[PDB]
Amino acid sequence: QGMIRHTVVFTLKHASHSLEEKRFLVDAKKILSAIRGVTHFEQLRQISPKIDYHFGFSMEFADQAAYTRYNDHPDHVAFVRDRWVPEVEKFLEIDYVPLG
Amino acid sequence: QGMIRHTVVFTLKHASHSLEEKRFLVDAKKILSAIRGVTHFEQLRQISPKIDYHFGFSMEFADQAAYTRYNDHPDHVAFVRDRWVPEVEKFLEIDYVPLG
């Protein structure tokens, strides 16, 4: 079936430009980009005024197997439990594959 | 300020797998990818079951000037008036710049 582009757009509970915000972004990058199968991990600022999300993470997986293996990796599980759930205010997951 | 990744996630009023759906996608690609400043135009299928959008378009602009010039291009204006507004059920625009 092929390549999957996994993305998440989000807003944190932390104040804009704070050290808490910086630390979430810096730590997420270090942790998530190190997981086997994660490719082209990018941190983004969301700039459209129409939707109320401040940031995004984007990455690509060779296939659904790699995506599932990332999701279930202990480092990802720990990150979601210990950082994402407590610090993220709101989010949308948007995953893509090439049209076909 | 730099590169802008312009994306739109959407659902059409047309039935899934129909010729009307095919034609919207085929024509959007031909029209939009030909506009000066549009780079890496990609048509995508949205696959997360959590959000109710079927497709996405993604493209990149060198800067905000190129983005604005695409938006205001007669071909884009005509496409939005004649195809997007009448055929799109719902959508979200999510634009990104590199964090940073």
Task: Tell me briefly what this model is.
Chain A is of the alpha+beta class.
Descriptive labels:
Alpha-Beta Plaits; globular; unknown function; 4 strands; homodimer; 37% helix; 35% strand; Stress responsive a/b barrel domain
How would you describe what is shown here?
- 2 copies of one chain form a homodimer.
- The first copy, chain A, is an alpha+beta fold.
- Chain A has a single domain (1-100), classed as 2-Layer Sandwich (Alpha-Beta Plaits).
- Chain A has 3 helices and 4 strands; from the N terminus they run E-H-E-E-H-H-E.
- Chain A has helices spanning 19-33, 64-71, 74-87, and strands spanning 4-12, 39-46, 55-61, 88-98.
- In chain A, helix 1 (19-33) packs antiparallel against helix 3.
- The PDB classes it as unknown function.
- The entry lists the keywords Stress responsive a/b barrel domain, structural genomics, Joint Center for Structural Genomics, jcsg, Protein Structure Initiative, PSI-2, unknown function.
Helix content of chain A: 25-40%
CATH architecture identity of chain A: 2-Layer Sandwich
Reading off the top of the CATH hierarchy, the class of chain A is best stated as Alpha Beta
The percent range for strand residues of chain A is: 35-45%
Assembly state here? homodimer
Q: Hey, which two chains have the biggest interface?
A: A-B, 26 and 26 residues
Outline of chain A: globular
The profile of the biggest β sheet of chain A is: 4 strands, antiparallel
Strand and helix layout:
Two copies of one chain form a homodimer.
Chain A: E1 4-12, H1 19-33, E2 39-46, E3 55-61, H2 64-71, H3 74-87, E4 88-98
